[PDB]
Amino acid sequence: SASAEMITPALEGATLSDGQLKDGGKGIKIDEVVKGSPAAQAGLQKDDVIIGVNRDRVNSIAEMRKVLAAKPAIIALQIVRGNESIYLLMR
């Protein structure tokens, strides 16, 4: 469970683990979100499934880690909450 604090300051208080979709798509599954943290301010929620970051498609922590190595101002986060696809950002 790699912490998101060491990836970007805005994602403090979130626990990440590589998860799979309902159809088997590789991604990251959210474990827990700390209430009142900047990550919770972005709308992070338990049991969520990450599938991509910005425009690049990701499958593990290393890929979006080296994507954020360039440190964009705002990270788009493709995510499938249930059967409805939503998005998560940062500031």
Contact residues: its own copies, CB under 8 A:
54-55, 72-74, 76, 78, 84-89
Least separation in angstroms between residue 84's CB and its own copies is 7
- Name the token pair of 14: 């979130």
Give CA–CA dist 42/48, Å, rounded: 13
Q: Given the complex with its own copies, which of 21 and 74 has the nearer CB atom?
A: 74
The terminus-to-terminus CA distance of the chain in angstroms comes to: 24
Q: Given the complex with its own copies, which of 3 and 66 has the nearer CB atom?
A: 66
Place of tokens 């954020």: 68
- Name the token pair of 60: 């593990």
Q: Given the complex with its own copies, which of 14 and 80 has the nearer CB atom?
A: 80
Least separation in angstroms between residue 75's CB and its own copies is 9
Least separation in angstroms between residue 52's CB and its own copies is 9
Give CA–CA dist 75/67, Å, rounded: 10
